[PDB]
Amino acid sequence: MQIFVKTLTGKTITLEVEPSDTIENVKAKIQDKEGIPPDQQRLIFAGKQLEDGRTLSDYNIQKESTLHLVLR
Numbered sequence: 485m486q487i488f489v490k491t492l493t494g495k496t497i498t499l500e501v502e503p504s505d506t507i508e509n510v511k512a513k514i515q516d517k518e519g520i521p522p523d524q525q526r527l528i529f530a531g532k533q534l535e536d537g538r539t540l541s542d543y544n545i546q547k548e549s550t551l552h553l554v555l556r
């Protein structure tokens with residue numbers, strides 16, 4: 485499914501992911517696509533900071549959802 489990642493620069497990146505994917509993989513996808521080191525990625529959804537060991541499904545993130553990316 486497709487999801488959006490809104491960065492603080494005003495750029496929104498599109499990503500193809502599965503609800504079963506882990507947050508660490510999502511960060512991996514972002515680094516692969518935008519080159520942002522995973523260690524600097526702070527993802528937020530619904531006011532919650534996402535944890536590397538959890539999955540998108542754990543947070544109820546569905547298609548067309550928008551995550552927020554703040555660089556650490």
Ligand SMILES: [Hg+2]
Binds near residue numbers: 550
């Ligand atoms: Hg938002």
